[PDB]
């Protein structure tokens, strides 16, 4: 019911494939995805807004993950 849709998210072209988690698209991560430059854009042949915890994770850590390298 609000767990046996599919990901909103176009890799290269495919349509992820992995079922939809409990998150949602936000502005936040369109600006990480921009920030990233990557080809991941929304679908607009959709009606929901949920993507799957493999996007969810993959976006979310990259702004978080660690504080030291160089600066
Ligand atoms: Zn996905």
């Known amino acids: 019911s609000n767990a046996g ?3 909103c998210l176009r890799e290269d ?7 939809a988690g409990n998150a949602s ?10 920030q990233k430059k990557v080809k991941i854009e929304l ?5 929901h807004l ?3 915890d493999y996007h969810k994770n993959l976006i979310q850590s990259v702004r ?4 030291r390298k160089g600066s």
């Open 5 to 7: 849709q599919l990901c």
């Open 13 to 19: 072209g495919e349509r992820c494939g992995r079922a």
């Open 25 to 34: 698209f936000s502005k936040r991560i369109q600006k990480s995805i921009s």
């Open 43 to 47: 679908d607009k042949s959709a009606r």
């Open 50 to 52: 949920y993507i799957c």
């Open 64 to 67: 978080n993950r660690r504080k």
